[PDB]
């Protein structure tokens, strides 16, 4: 993974040593939300509002 460093010498280390991982239910469900969030923005080519 991406090591914070600030210690030891150089390089990275196994993330499984600290028992840190992302649950599949969190990652898999976040992909469907991230695609639909950017789809709405790219699909809107015009906006109309009023002064408030």
């Amino acid at each position: 993974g991406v090591d914070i460093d600030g210690e030891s010498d150089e390089g990275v280390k196994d993330i499984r040593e600290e028992n840190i991982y992302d649950m599949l239910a969190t990652k898999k469900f976040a992909i469907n939300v991230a695609t639909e969030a950017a789809t709405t923005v790219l699909s809107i080519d015009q906006i109309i509002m009023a002064k408030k």
Partner: protein, 531 residues
């Protein structure tokens, strides 16, 4: 000494120019490759709709020219229900094609009269181009591809496969096979948040708002009798004015229980009906509707007998339950009869803390349907509902009218080719009529060019491949329909792909857009009066 020929041209040009701005806005969202427009009032109202008529109602236009454009779709949504954006594209583009002819000195009457002549000739070619479809119920497999025409337009095509069986099975289930008609008012649409739009499923019965809350209620009840209960089970009082006089708190329960005996006396006759007919028989259930409220004492009584308790039902939804279940409304408990009980299938209630729905589904003759659209966000509820209401009204004219027309610009390209070669052979109208027919033929070719423009493919290449294919089909002595394929970019067979449009939708689209666009060029001057 003032006599002016300067009245030739006037704000009519601005009337055409104002229509050009509305065209460029509604040109991008036309078709399944279009864009999803978003309008915000500023008070928290956010609606995302690709339909043109829906958006124009929330936007005020000072230009009177665009007012008649929005009013022209009033008859389209109430009859055809589809193609509101296509009609607007035909009105705006026809003004641009006629702009070059006005500057050359062509009088607008010949331009106006030339459109009515081409409109009457288009109706003669429309009867030969249409295809009559049988009323047999074996066409459901063919109706699946036809229903996708309205579905693929308003969504990203990922939810089309989910809503395809729901829309198809909704109309055909309640419709016996005959001429008759179909009624979309019997289909109710409800919404609930905190769920994904991919969970949308078909509902055969009616969905109820307030469900029963108790841990011991049975989850699944198969073959249960529905009984309408019109009496209030809440706390009741003596029929005459009185009061509660108690010296101690123990004496209050004696006077309070005296008024509660009226409710408990009617509950003894209700529980006896369950054990009277199929009491100990397996796969049996007894469900109480009870539109009115429920007292907390009956919660433990109905739980021991596995009786579903419901309260606070909508008055409009009760009229449909009498048709689906068949049980008559029972006002008095003493008059309750065993024949009042109806028929129902397996009833399962989903457990959710926010709301609980009761499924009336799985009936012999429900004669009703419910389309449940659920989504987490606000725009997911409005966008999907727009595709369902447009899909039901598009198929509505498919079952009523036996004629069907291929879509994807099949009729727009073919009609422009027929009217082009037929004008030189007839020559029975006038020599100046060619300006109106050529402008009307070129105004119909914008629809196939608009669909391909949003896809990114060159509109010049698709126009040449279709015209070259139609010339080879005439010399081969056969009938082959050609259409625009947006995914690949080449031509396609509309019969194999399954793109089809109703006859009444395109009939009023060409006729409606012709009269409205012709009346725009008839305006001599724009007058401001009344203030």
């Amino acid at each position: 000494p003032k006599a002016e020929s300067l009245r030739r041209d006037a704000a009519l040009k601005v009337n055409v120019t104002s229509a050009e701005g509305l065209q460029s806005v509604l040109e991008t969202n036309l078709g399944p490759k279009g864009t999803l427009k978003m309008l915000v009032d500023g008070a928290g109202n956010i609606k995302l709709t690709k339909d043109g008529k829906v958006l124009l109602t929330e936007m005020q236009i000072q230009s009177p020219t665009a007012v008649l454009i929005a009013r022209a779709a009033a008859a389209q949504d109430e009859i055809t229900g589809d193609g509101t954006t296509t009609v607007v594209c035909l009105v705006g583009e026809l003004l641009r094609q006629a702009h070059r002819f006005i500057q050359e000195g062509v009088h607008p009457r010949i331009i106006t009269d030339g459109f009515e002549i081409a409109r009457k000739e288009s109706m003669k070619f429309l009867d030969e181009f249409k295809i009559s479809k049988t009323n047999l119920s074996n066409d459901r497999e063919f109706l699946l591809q036809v229903a996708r025409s309205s579905l693929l337009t308003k969504v990203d095509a990922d939810l089309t496969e989910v809503l395809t069986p729901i829309v198809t099975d909704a109309v055909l289930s309640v419709y016996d096979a005959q001429a008759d008609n179909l009624d979309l008012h019997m289909v109710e649409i409800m919404q609930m948040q905190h769920l994904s739009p991919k969970d949308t499923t078909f509902i055969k019965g009616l969905v109820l708002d307030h469900g029963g809350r108790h841990p011991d209620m049975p989850t699944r009840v198969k073959n249960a009798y529905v009984l309408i209960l019109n009496v209030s089970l809440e706390y009741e009082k003596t029929e005459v004015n009185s009061g509660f006089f108690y010296s101690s708190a123990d004496q209050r329960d004696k006077l309070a229980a005296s008024e509660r005996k009226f409710v408990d006396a009617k509950l003894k006759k209700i529980i006896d009906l369950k054990n009277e007919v199929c009491g100990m028989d397996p796969d049996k259930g007894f469900v109480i509707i009870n539109q009115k409220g429920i007292d907390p004492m009956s919660l433990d009584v109905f739980a021991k007998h596995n009786i579903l308790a419901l309260r606070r039902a909508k008055r409009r939804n009760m009229e449909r339950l009498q048709l689906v279940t068949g049980g008559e409304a029972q006002n008095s408990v003493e008059d309750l009869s065993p024949q009042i009980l109806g028929f129902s299938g397996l009833v399962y209630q989903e457990t959710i803390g926010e709301e609980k729905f009761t499924y009336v589904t799985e009936n012999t003759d429900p004669k009703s349907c419910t389309i449940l659209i659920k989504g987490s966000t606000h725009y997911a509820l409005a966008q999907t509902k727009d595709a369902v209401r447009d899909g039901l009204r598009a198929v509505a004219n498919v079952l009523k009218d036996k004629n069907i027309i291929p879509g994807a610009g099949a009729f727009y390209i073919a009609l422009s080719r027929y009217l082009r070669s037929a004008n030189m052979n007839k020559l029975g109208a006038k020599g100046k009529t060619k300006t109106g027919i050529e402008a009307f033929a070129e105004a119909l070719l914008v629809i196939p060019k608009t669909l391909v423009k949003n896809s990114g493919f060159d509109p010049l290449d698709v126009l040449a491949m279709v015209e070259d294919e139609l010339d080879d089909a005439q010399d081969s002595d056969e009938t082959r329909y050609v259409g625009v394929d947006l995914n690949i970019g080449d031509s396609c067979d509309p019969t194999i792909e399954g793109i089809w449009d109703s006859y009444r939708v395109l009939r009023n689209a060409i006729t409606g857009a012709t009269g409205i666009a012709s009346n725009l060029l008839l305006c001599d001057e724009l007058l401001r009066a009344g203030r």
